[PDB]
Amino acid sequence: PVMEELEQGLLMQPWAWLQLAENSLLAKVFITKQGYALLVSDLQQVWHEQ
Amino acid sequence: CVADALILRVRSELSGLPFYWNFHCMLASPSLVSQHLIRPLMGMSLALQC
Amino acid sequence: CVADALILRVRSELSGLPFYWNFHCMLASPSLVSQHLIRPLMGMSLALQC
């Protein structure tokens, strides 16, 4: 399948800084033709969506 | 944020037309948080100590 | 561990008598994990880089 590939790509990727309208967070995105995986954090909580 | 969730809205213009997307991220499980932040951090700390 | 909690049993000889204790620990909230592991490790890594 592609879930394993998405997980591996998300793990291997580096962190990035995202500056929103009022705040900032750390982001990790891996998008393939079959879907995507995203992991965000603000140093207090972590969210994830595949 | 609505209820233990993170709505991340991205709005863009492609070819001069609106393009909206929404990430409905949810709190990550303990396994993902650990595997993505905790163990790598200790690895970097040990490498820097060496 | 049964379903999601950790039972940690300490059995000791208090000078020749039983001493049983049972820690019934639940999953730590995201705030505790970030406060105790994530941020301190990042600080340690930055200090070691310096």
Query: Can you give the resolution of this entry in Å?
Result: 2.8
Way it was determined: cryo-EM
Residue of B33, B36, B41, B42 for testing the chain C interface, max C β-carbons within 10 Å? B41
Pairwise CA distance, residues A47 & A42, whole Å: 9
3-state secondary structure of A2: coil
The C-alpha atoms of residue A21 and residue C46 are separated, in whole angstroms, by 28
Minimum Cα–Cα distance from B24: chain A residue: A49
**What is the Cα B6 distance to its own chain's centre?**
10
Q: Please count the residues of chain C.
A: 50
A41/B27 CB distance under 8 A = no
Partner C contacted by A44 (CB < 8 A) = yes
The answer to whether residue C50 neighbours chain B at the CB level (below 8 Å) is: no
